[PDB]
Amino acid sequence: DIAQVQVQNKLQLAMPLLPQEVQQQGVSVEKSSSSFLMVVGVINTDGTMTQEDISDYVAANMKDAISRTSGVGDVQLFGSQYAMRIWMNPNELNKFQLTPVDVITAIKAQNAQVAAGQLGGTPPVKGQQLNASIIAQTRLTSTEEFGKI
Amino acid sequence: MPNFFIDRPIFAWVIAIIIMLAGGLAILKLPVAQYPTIAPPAVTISASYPGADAKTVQDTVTQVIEQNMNGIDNLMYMSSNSDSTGTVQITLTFESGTDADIAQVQVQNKLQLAMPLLPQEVQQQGVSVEKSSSSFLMVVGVINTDGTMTQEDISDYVAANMKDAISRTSGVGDVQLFGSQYAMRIWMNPNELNKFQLT
Amino acid sequence: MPNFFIDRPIFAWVIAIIIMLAGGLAILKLPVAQYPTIAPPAVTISASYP
Amino acid sequence: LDTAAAIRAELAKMEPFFPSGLKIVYPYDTTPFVKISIHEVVKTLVEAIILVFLVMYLFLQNFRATLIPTIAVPVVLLGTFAVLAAFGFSINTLTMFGMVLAIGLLVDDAIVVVENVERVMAEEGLPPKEATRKSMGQIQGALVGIAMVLSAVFVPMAFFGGSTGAIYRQFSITIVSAMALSVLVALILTPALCATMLK
Amino acid sequence: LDTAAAIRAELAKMEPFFPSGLKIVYPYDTTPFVKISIHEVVKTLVEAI
Amino acid sequence: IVVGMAYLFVRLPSSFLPDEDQGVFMTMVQLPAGATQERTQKVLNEVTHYYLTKEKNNVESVFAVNGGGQNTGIAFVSLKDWADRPGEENKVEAITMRATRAFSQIKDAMVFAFNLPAIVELGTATGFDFELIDQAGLGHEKLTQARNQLLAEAAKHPDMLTSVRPNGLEDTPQFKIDIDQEKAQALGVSINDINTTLGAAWGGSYVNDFIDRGRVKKVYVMSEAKYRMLPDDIGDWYVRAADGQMVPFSAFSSSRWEYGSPRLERYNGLPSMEILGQAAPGKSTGEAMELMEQLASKLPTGVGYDWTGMSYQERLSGNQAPSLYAISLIVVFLCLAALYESWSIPFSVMLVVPLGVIGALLAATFRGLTNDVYFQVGLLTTIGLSAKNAILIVEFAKDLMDKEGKGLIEATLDAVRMRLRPILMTSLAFILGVMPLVISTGAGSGAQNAVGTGVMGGMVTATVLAIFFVPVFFVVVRRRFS
Amino acid sequence: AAWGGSYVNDFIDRGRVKKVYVMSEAKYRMLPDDIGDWYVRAADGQMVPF
């Protein structure tokens, strides 16, 4: 335990020195054996779901819950959790005269979750009878939503 | 071994007196509680996204903490509350008799695996990892008899003279202030902002 | 201490039975591994620059 | 109580430098409760000692013969606290109640020790010093086996029940300690006192 | 074995809520080995008796 | 006596630790939605008015704390000294009851008054804590509906389940502001400007720190109260375009109402909803649990379930502790067989146990008390004491048999008179000794009673029964086995 | 971003937060000459090849 702790203490002595991309992708400190205990394979008999689908499911329903169990020091997933993939097209980007930077920024602008306070929160004027939170821009949820950005 | 002590009384007297002295000492140094520590360890992480709503809070702070929460020793269960007041409270419970210190440490280690994933507003407002009981020990009220200072003034004073010093004392896992420390408040006026054309 | 237990058999029986109960318990709670933790502790830090 | 006692320490360093009108109040204090709990247990302990002394003097009509079990009470009780410190137990409610219960299983051993010698003297007229040899040599194995079986009824309760069972352990150890101590005293102090004090 | 025994516990809470076609398999299990090891020792113990 | 003992044992209710008057108690105040701070304050003031006016003789100080959030409230009530509150009519058991009865009146305010569950967070009694899981991508609506289904079906079985309710909050109205991006770009305003203005005006913003009298504090920017209390006020705000023109919010933002939860709950990562509830006054927490697990199976696909807190207790008593009792009994029998050097003779000692349990049970039942920890340690204490009392008699008799050669029919009664006086001494002395415990009035009295009654009754009965039973217990065992 | 992909921000898929990666399609990052297929926007408004 301590032998992991001191390590992470000294790690976060240089976290702000790491690139922003690395910090976002996040580091990870573990204390595990180099040998696997057991491997739990998940297959599809109906042929309905491909390996990426299965990997997503076992990443979003199984891995996150199994790994929480004590004694389990490191679960290496044999796949990848789902992620919204934007496959750019340079020809059409140059056609409309756009850079990947414009796309990035457009995503960070139109796909965000903003804090927008409450209708008559604290403090209020005397005699207020209405107090409700306010919703503004929320995250996006589907392919189509990123489609019409 | 009777008839040996029966022949030598003062010996038995010495044993008994030594015993009474040992007990006499051990009744001074020994801590006086109501019951032993029976409740399971409960490490709690707390954050606050200022001016946010429940889903905004959960989807951008809570969920991004829960996923990075794994590979932690003797974890029983994790329950997280996401409030519309802009607040996350995740209470991890550990096995009975588990080393509390380590059980807090591993938690914070896994927390700072996703700190740069938190919003800038949250990081600035700062998260907080504690290891405390859900029941209050004692509550120290501070009042004003002269009528000179209002509750916000009193709260400021006890936040800037008392809370910060009391909480440093060992054994005290979490001091919940019943007020708010002073802060420079800028109360904007949209009419005059638009008048001079300012955002 | 032979001829004392030799004169009182049930006493020895009590000792032995207590022993067997202790072992009977300690075979339930005791963890069943292959070998003890022999490998040295290995803390690993991992990062990824995409 | 260490914490709530350190609170007043860290707080009395602020009281003088307080502004005009600040008064501290305590609207919630779950500390004097444990105080007037443990105190109210010590009270019943003392009262039990007194009443035991009264029954003793009611039967064995000697003012020095009734001192023997009386003396043998704090000896066994104090010594328990010592063992409770040597295992890591605290002077909580459960422990104290364990003592109050241990009273009877102390005074039983004591009374057997004294009264058997008394009887032997009233039926054989042997000089106390010899009568007590011939008596301890008659009740020794009885007392020891009694220790074994009583410890046998109390010990297994220390296991295990988790949260709820911790209390059962608090009682078990506190009681068995006082048992073995009561019997050790029953072979060391009580025979010696029943040899040098009895009329 | 506590870990690999807790795995099936945390896993049987997912089996019912699985989609149409998902089947779990165990292609690597260094757990029944220790089982039919210690068992095969107890066996020789009895036989020795 | 054995039969009646069993009957009194299964008829007697179960408990853990008694609620002790701690001189202080709490009062919870929950309001609807959204319920402004003013309403909560009014309710808290009604409460304080009650505790200060309708109960001056007992209540000393009410530290009421409005906060977190607007619709919640909590009062820490302190009482006067125990010696200044005589009788049951002044203890917390009556104060809290009377108070909550008086709080039944209050409209649109779930106000309750309750006493501290013994110690810290050891409130591992009083019902259960069922948790409902979103084991799939169902969302929040269908989870609310499923929880509604469970809470609806659970009110149709009031014969083994009660007080079925959620613990969190119900959906409240919310204000959605649709920022039309196209119009925002067309008018030439920056989206960052929009979101920043909105969040800073309506939600405040941590700018940077400042120094107040040597101590660093914060600087928050936030609209004044007047311009953030009503929906139309959204229009009062203007953001600066790229050119230099100020643009109203109504120009690009389309506002509307909606519905959202104010306390989202998650369990083990997955979305969840907490459901509280008690067991029926007659049934056990276990059967309530089983019923709940059968009702939650009738729920739509994807909604799982799990037990937490005082439901992850866990296991089992009384359903395992009798094994502790059993093995202890076995061990005792062993040591007894060791002392007596017989497999039969110790039975004469073993049969003395029910002679004391029958006293504890009678005492506990004829006082409204309950089988708790104190009662059980007092029980073990009782059986140990009685065991001692018997053991000394049988040992004396067997000494009279194996040293002199006296037959049982003489050696027994000869030894009993050699043992009668000390038995009576120890007995009477210990009975009077625990009298202060059973007599205890106020301040930790529930505990001293729970320890006192069972012990005294058990001791009396054991010492008035074994004194006639043990001499018979021996001769029956001795004859039958030789 | 084109050749190595980029972690932009997160999004919500069926209640669970996941990532959003931007990255060129496969066809335009397989060969060296494809470097030339990319254009960046200058300060004036003209697109410039790599």
From Swiss-Prot, chain A:
Subunit structure: Homotrimer, with large domains that extend into the periplasm, interacts with AcrA and TolC. AcrA may be required to stably link this protein and TolC. Interacts with AcrZ. Part of the AcrA-AcrB-AcrZ-TolC efflux pump.
Induction behaviour: Positively regulated by MarA, Rob and SoxS transcriptional regulators (at protein level).
Entire-sequence positions represented here: 101 to 249 of 1049
Knockout or disruption consequences: Loss of susceptibility to contact-dependent growth inhibition (CDI); inhibiting cells still contact the target.
Protein name: Multidrug efflux pump subunit AcrB
Reported function: AcrA-AcrB-AcrZ-TolC is a drug efflux protein complex with broad substrate specificity that uses the proton motive force to export substrates.
Compartment list: Cell inner membrane
Gene, per the UniProt record: acrB
Entry similarity comment: Belongs to the resistance-nodulation-cell division (RND) (TC 2.A.6) family.
